[PDB]
Amino acid sequence: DDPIGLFVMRPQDGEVTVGGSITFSARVAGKPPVVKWFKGKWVDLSSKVGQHLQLHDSYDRASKVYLFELHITDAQPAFTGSYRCEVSTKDKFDCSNFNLTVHE
Amino acid sequence: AALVIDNGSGMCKAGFAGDDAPRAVFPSIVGRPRHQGVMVGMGQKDSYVGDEAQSKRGILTLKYPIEHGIVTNWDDMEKIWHHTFYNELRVAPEEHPVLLTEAPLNPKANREKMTQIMFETFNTPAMYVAIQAVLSLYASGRTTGIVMDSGDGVTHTVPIYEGYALPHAILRLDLAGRDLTDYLMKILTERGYSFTTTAEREIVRDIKEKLCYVALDFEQEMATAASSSSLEKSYELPDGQVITIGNERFRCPEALFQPSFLGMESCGIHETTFNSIMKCDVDIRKDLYANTVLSGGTTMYPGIADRMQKEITALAPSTMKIKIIAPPERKYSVWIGGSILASLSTFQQMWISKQEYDESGPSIVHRKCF
Amino acid sequence: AALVIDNGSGMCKAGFAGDDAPRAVFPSIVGRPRHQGVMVGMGQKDSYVGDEAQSKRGILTLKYPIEHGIVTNWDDMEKIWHHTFYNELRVAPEEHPVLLTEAPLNPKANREKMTQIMFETFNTPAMYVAIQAVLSLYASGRTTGIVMDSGDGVTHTVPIYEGYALPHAILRLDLAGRDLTDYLMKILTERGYSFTTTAEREIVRDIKEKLCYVALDFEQEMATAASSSSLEKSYELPDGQVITIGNERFRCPEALFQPSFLGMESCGIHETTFNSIMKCDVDIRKDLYANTVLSGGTTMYPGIADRMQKEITALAPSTMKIKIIAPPERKYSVWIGGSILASLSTFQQMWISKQEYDESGPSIVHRKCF
Amino acid sequence: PEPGKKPVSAFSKKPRSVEVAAGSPAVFEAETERAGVKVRWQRGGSDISASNKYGLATEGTRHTLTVREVGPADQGSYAVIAGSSKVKFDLKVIE
């Protein structure tokens, strides 16, 4: 099929209402890999961390898989768009594309 | 027109470029309800911003968005900016470029995020981030000199010669008016009066800005404090409690001069100015001494200029005369610099465009400006 | 035996002549009680000397006896010498001649006073003051060449031809490792980390010694710092704070190569070596380039020799090949030169005697040696 | 006496001073003899451009400036430049 990437689990598309909470995550197989979250193209979510957006990284020993999460709370209409999840490791680079839509 | 906002610690000054006085002056604070409200007629109003907070100060717990020239919480600042453009200015951010004033050798994140929020949260064609030492230099009207800029947030020194700058010569000092307030509250406790609440923290600051003054000589007044007759005044709290202070009020401003009370190794404001001067070229030193400019919130107290003049003259070489210029309303001088800077046609070309930000990124700020 | 003391900026290295490793290695610092103590049973030790100070570093305000190769306070130096001879060496000054190493074009008072303290404070039959460039030459084992001597004290260049020296040709450079540390502390503040204390000043220096390395090309790595992966490492402080650095570590060593970051007009170390060569005779120039020797505290970082080699080869004429000899443990090479210099029989006749000082006077130092 | 004739003017119609109420709209009309040139407007401290709070209407040789946020801080002088020609007018505000 396609080459085997860093993500054991690819992020999935999600839709949320205004003032609701939505969580997106990506799993990377096992030093700690670097993960970047991008909005639309040249916009970095890591520099947009605040009340509305939070970032969290965790490790699960049983499956030897790192879990990366994006936390969105009190979502606003301005947050509707395309989001890119990029994870890089010392030997390989890979990314995924997903869309967050908030309606009504 | 144009929009000029001063983001210095404690007070948020906003107004229109090309105007001699700003439209909106209020403290930069966010107040939240510490206590549980037990009423059925309230909208509950979880967050309060500006002077509204000052009236409701006792119940609310005040939090400063900006600490040491660095903003701890970004959305609080957004609420402040929203409050300044709409509530007092009554104008849209879209309408004009907005100028913000920033202290020298400030961290990269503050410039990048500040522009990002200005461009994204409030839509504006262009904006510019300026450095306080250079703006005062133009206000002064001199192409060569040394600028000591002490704002409410942090004290900075930035010498200049004929358009050329010396990064090594630029010295950042951690002494500020807010720091004095913390020292002041700490000093009050040994006299038997203790303040451990943010709402009452302002009350000592209020005392400091009008009751406090600067002694010609610290050691001589403190010595004469034992037999105080005219050194003590009565302060009236909203509470109704009566407070009388003596040598305590003039020894607070002293700490900037004498950090040893604070407990920090680093030298006071007059020694730091001298240090910066030494770094600078010998040829330009002579006009540096005769044109010292004082600015900021804590430079307000009378007699500072006289104490600084004798202290700088004594420690410094006598080869040249020492002249210090300390005009009134120097506290608002930083905002004034912002309004005059935005009033220059050449300057408008210089503003950092929204398009430029998106094409290259936040890191271009250092690249574009000094 | 014999006594060899390397009085450099920062660290004082002491030991016995004929040994391949010194007995004592501790910083040359003075510790005093900044804050008053409130206890019963303490000896109230007002002054602390050596590594003891390092242990009790936070309360104590450290002061360096030696600034830019110049000693600010003579008594403190005496305490250091007392500490080195008795505490680690465990020997008396009377027992052996003592050798001290001093930089070129140093003021007369430092050599005269240093001998005076060596004679009057510590009783010894003889002592000698040596010059680092000539000692390195002997260590090298060559009669002709050009010596580039750089260390904690200051960078010095002294050309030599068949035993004859040219005082005019000797060039002193003001760039040193300690200076880099001051630049480094200054550079950290923009990132968001600030160090304003002498005790923590050492910690950045410690970071520089192992974490920092010299980049083959400054612009290339800085450019690739945007996507830093292997560039950033985590340093652990005694405090329990985590520091992360990236492009910052290699840019510090760069300043010696590229003074423009410092803001000074003076050329870097490779250009200065070149300038000294130009002063020297054209005939002897050909072996000067292939006999370049690196010694001192700031020459420790790997890749310096490789960067210097390409830069000297590029700037210099292609008429001759360029070879630089930079063996490991070059930091201690200056001290080693002192120990080897004392070892030769010829040298012992050459030491400046106590009797000669008393009769002829302090001015004989220039007369007796180069 | 004053000079008999002025240089080659860039404005067909010169904006004229008017008086307005406090907080009420202010509208200025200016015209230029030669088309194809942009007209820049300046206020007693800052430049005026097509943006909100201010309104620029340009058609052919006619330029219109509208200010709806004008108040006590606009008292002073306004300058308008078309190409190489500069002309200024005064706005009076009565509280």
Sign of CA dihedral C348, C349, C354, C357: negative
CA distances from B324 to B148, B254, B311, C328 (A): 11, 18, 11, 55
Q: Which residue of C has its CA nearest to B264?
A: C197
Q: Of B331, B353, B349, B370, which Cα lies nearest the Cα of B153?
A: B331
The H-assigned helical ranges of C299-353 are 304-315, 333-343, 345-350
Q: Is A89 on the interface with C (CB under 8 A)?
A: no
Q: Do chains B and D touch (3 or more CB pairs under 8 A)?
A: yes
Q: Is B347 on the interface with D (CB under 8 A)?
A: no
Please give the residue of chain C at the shortest CA–CA distance from A89: C229
Crossing angle of helices C304-315 and C247-257, in 10° steps, is: 40
Q: Do A50 and B74 touch (CB under 8 A)?
A: yes
Q: Helix axis angle, C269-279 relative to C282-290, nearest 10°?
A: 150
Q: Which residues of B touch A52 (CB under 8 A)?
A: 75
* Pair type for strands B324-325 and B292-293: parallel
Mutating which of D40, D42, D47 best tests the B interface, going by the most B Cβ atoms within 10 A?
D47
Are chains A and D in contact at 3+ CB pairs closer than 8 Å? no
Q: Do B75 and A42 touch (CB under 8 A)?
A: no
List of chain B residues whose C-beta atoms are within 8 Å of the C-beta of residue C262: 168
The DSSP H or E segment spanning C111 is helix C108-120
- CB atoms D45 and B348 under 8 Å: no
Distance, in Å, from the CA atom of B293 to the CA atom of B291, rounded to the nearest integer, reads 6
Chains that touch B (3 or more CB pairs under 8 A): A, C, D
Contacts of B74 in chain A (CB under 8 A): 50
Structure tokens at C223: 């450019």
Residue with tokens 């923009």: C190
Structure tokens at D9: 């003017």
B168 and C189 in contact by Cβ < 8 A? no
What is the amino acid identity at position C35?
Answer: H
Q: Is B227 on the interface with D (CB under 8 A)?
A: no
Q: Is A34 on the interface with C (CB under 8 A)?
A: yes
Residue B171 CA, chain-centre distance (Å), reads 17
CB contact under 8 A, B167 and C263: yes
Rounded Cα distance, C6 and C30, in Å: 17
Instruction: Determine which helix (DSSP H) or strand (DSSP E) holds C159, and give its type and residue range.
Output: strand C155-161
Burial class, A70, CB count within 10 angstroms (exposed 0-12 / middle 13-18 / buried 19+):
buried
Partners of chain C (3+ Cβ pairs below 8 A): A, B
By the CB < 8 Å criterion, does B349 face chain D? no
Q: Which residues contact B250 (CB under 8 A, 6 or more apart)?
A: B212, B213, B214, B215, B218, B221, B231
Considering only CB atoms, D47 lies closest to which of B92, B125, B348, namely B348
Take residue C264 and report the two structure tokens written for it: 């000074």
**B346: closest CA of chain D, how far (Å):** 11
The sign of the CA dihedral C9, C15, C17, C19 is: negative
- Residues B147 and B171: their CA atoms lie apart, in Å, by 11
A81 Rama sector, left if φ>0, alpha if ψ -120 to 50, beta otherwise = left
Would the CA dihedral through D68, D71, D74, D77 be positive or negative? positive
**In the sheet where B30-33 sits, what is the strand order?**
B48-49, B30-33, B60-63
Interface test with C, best of B158, B168, B369 (most C CBs within 10 A): B168
Between CA D7 and CA C190 the distance in angstroms is 55
Q: Do B1 and D52 touch (CB under 8 A)?
A: no
Nearest Cα to Cα of residue B2 among D44, D14, C331: D44
Q: Where are the alpha helices (DSSP H) in chain B?
A: 51-55, 74-83, 108-121, 132-140, 177-190, 198-210, 218-223, 247-257, 269-279, 282-290, 304-315, 333-341, 345-350, 354-360, 364-368
C87 interfacial to chain B (CB closer than 8 Å)? no
- Report CB contact under 8 Å: B96, D51: yes
Q: Cβ distance C123 to C73 under 8 Å?
A: no
* B112/A47 touch (CB, cutoff 8 Å), yes or no: yes
Q: Are A44 and A61 in contact (CB under 8 A)?
A: no
Q: How many CB atoms lie within 10 A of CB D37?
A: 14
Strands C171-173, C155-161: pairing kind: antiparallel
- Residue B123 forms contact with D (CB below 8 Å): no
Integer Cα distance of B121 and B82 in angstroms: 9
Residues A50, A68: Cα–Cα separation, whole Å = 18
Contacts of D52 in chain B (CB under 8 A): 92, 94-95
Task: Identify whether the C-beta of residue C116 lies closer than 8 Å to the C-beta of residue C362.
Answer: yes
- The CB-side HSE value for B23 (13 A sphere, CA atoms) comes to 23
Nearest 10 degrees: Cα torsion B264, B265, B270, B276: -120
Token pair 């001073």 in the structure block, residue? D17
Backbone angles phi, psi at B331, to 5 degrees: -60, -40
Question: Chains near A, with 3+ CB pairs < 8 A?
Answer: B, C
Annotated binding site of A: 54, 56, 69, 71
Identify which of B75, B112, B358 has the shortest CB distance to residue A50: B75
φ, ψ of residue D72 to 5 degrees: the values are -60, -30
Chain B, 152 to 171: residues with Cβ < 8 Å from chain C are 166-169
Burial of B28: CB neighbours in 10 Å, binned 0-12, 13-18, 19+: buried
B192 touches chain C (CB under 8 A): no
Question: H or E element: which one contains C54?
Answer: helix C51-55
Nearest chain A residue to C230, by CA = A90
Which residues in chain D have their CB less than 8 angstroms from residue B89's CB?
Answer: none
Identity of the amino acid at B289: Y
Q: What is the C-alpha to C-alpha distance for residues C169 and C183, in angstroms, rounded to an integer?
A: 29
Chain D positions touching B342 (Cβ under 8 A) are 46
Question: What does DSSP say about strands C70-71 and B352-353: parallel, antiparallel, or unpaired?
Answer: unpaired
Give the tokens for residue B238: 């909203």
| Contacting residues of C for B172, CB less than 8 Å apart | 189
Obtained via which technique?
cryo-EM
Cα angle vertex B238, ends B234, B239, to 5°? 90
Q: How far is CA C266 from CA C263, C272, C273, in A?
A: 9, 9, 12
CB atoms within 10 A of CB C276: 22
CB contact set of B132 (below 8 Å; sequence gap of 6+): B101, B102, B103, B104, B149, B151, B156, B295, B334, B337
Cβ(C210)–Cβ(C303) under 8 Å?
Answer: no
* Alpha carbon distance B20, B4 (integer Å): 12
Residues of chain B neighbouring C190 (CB-CB closer than 8 A) = 105-108
Strands A22-29 and A7-9: antiparallel
Per the listing, tokens 């689990």 go with A9
